[PDB]
Amino acid sequence: RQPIALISVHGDPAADVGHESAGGQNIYVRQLGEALAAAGWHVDMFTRKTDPNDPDVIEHSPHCRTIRLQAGPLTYIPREKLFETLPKFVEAFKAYHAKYGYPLIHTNYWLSGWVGWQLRQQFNFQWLHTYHSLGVVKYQVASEQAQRDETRLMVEKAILENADCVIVTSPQEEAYLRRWVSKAGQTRLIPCGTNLKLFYPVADARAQLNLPADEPIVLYVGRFDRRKGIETLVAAMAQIPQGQLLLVGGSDPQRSDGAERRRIEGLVQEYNLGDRVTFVGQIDHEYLAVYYSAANVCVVPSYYEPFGLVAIEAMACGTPVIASAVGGLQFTVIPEETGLLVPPQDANALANAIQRILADPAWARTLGKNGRERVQALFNWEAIALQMGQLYRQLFAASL
Ligand SMILES: O=P(O)(O)OC[C@H]1O[C@@](CO)(O[C@H]2O[C@H](CO)[C@@H](O)[C@H](O)[C@H]2O)[C@@H](O)[C@@H]1O
Ligand SMILES: O=c1ccn([C@@H]2O[C@H](COP(=O)(O)OP(=O)(O)O)[C@@H](O)[C@H]2O)c(=O)[nH]1
């Protein structure tokens, strides 16, 4: 049985998701490696060790490990400073590569992509890469991310020019690569999926959450970042008379994605919205279906999203999604079949969008079931795993 190295440096697949350096990349590599181990592969998922009180090896499912390498300091470092920790990481990979001799390495970030680019000069292997965010789309915002990183753009160009395969999660991602990065390189459209056994209409959700069933609810699920546009959602909540906003997401006050940019609470006291904005905190990923099902609308008010995964998590639970028209959100959300699409930084358009589907609840209840069908059709992980597996089989078929 052949081995597989999955490299996700700041994304620990053994980590609970919902805070800084957590989220969709973590969920992506975790369910990918666990699905591949279910289909006859040996999977080692490589991440960075951030605490000596953490385990070195985490065995999730049979023949599926998470391996925390000692890259740099054994503390938390945000990814914008992890580049200097990368060559040591390379060395800490090589010992494992000395034992197993990985024929196939699938790197999942810029930083881990640089690690795979260093390994590509020394060893012969099938190298695949998923970006999970392009810096060239990141560094175009009138808000934050004008302070660029040309090292990131150089490496994100050098990955696409040299990797054997590049997994794009949306046709917008390939369009952004071909317009803004390079024309060379091989690419493959395999979109992100969700577990329909973990996301489903619960139909008992407000009784579990102790919420009044005749009161409207607007739902945000995601991280705390200026990228996510919670400012615009809170400003649009002031144009709606009834209804609470449940902000679900974790944060750490010692950290930047946390009480340095959980200033939304200040915006809660700006707009006099303390009676009708609830900060839920971090909810477990296997329990979010109750929050998605209890709500009348999930909002993804981002300023860019390379395949917003809470959109398909919400549509899987039968809840319509109002989202920005920026990235993979306009690949997931059909603007009149499953939800609505608004411009990013205007609260008036977002507020009129919420007004349309709070005033017509049966229309929201059929937008939600259409989102359920669309997720069952195109974004079911139980089929996307088979597509990924056949991709690995044909790439491993590159033999003598
Ligand atoms: O915002 P950045 O500094 O560019 O960091 C990228 C940010 O996005 C994460 C969340 O952990 O996930 C990305 O990839 C997943 C799946 O591919 C998407 O669902 C998600 O939309 C996308 O942001 C992660 O890479 C980083 O924190
Ligand atoms: O309390 C939370 C808050 C968020 N998430 C998950 O974190 C993931 C990240 O969502 P997304 O891809 O849309 O944004 P990202 O953070 O990955 O860029 C989603 O599956 C969310 O369900 C979670 O599990 N618990």
From TrEMBL:
The keyword Transferase applies. CDD domains: GT4_sucrose_synthase. InterPro entries: Glyco_trans_1, Glyco_trans_4-like_N. Residues 205-374 form the Glycosyl transferase family domain. Residues 23-193 form the Glycosyltransferase subfamily 4-like N-terminal domain. Pfam families: Glyco_trans_4_4, Glycos_transf_1. Keywords: Glycosyltransferase, Nucleotide-binding, Transferase. UDP binds at G24, R223, R227, K228, I283, L309, V310, E313. This is Tll1590 protein.
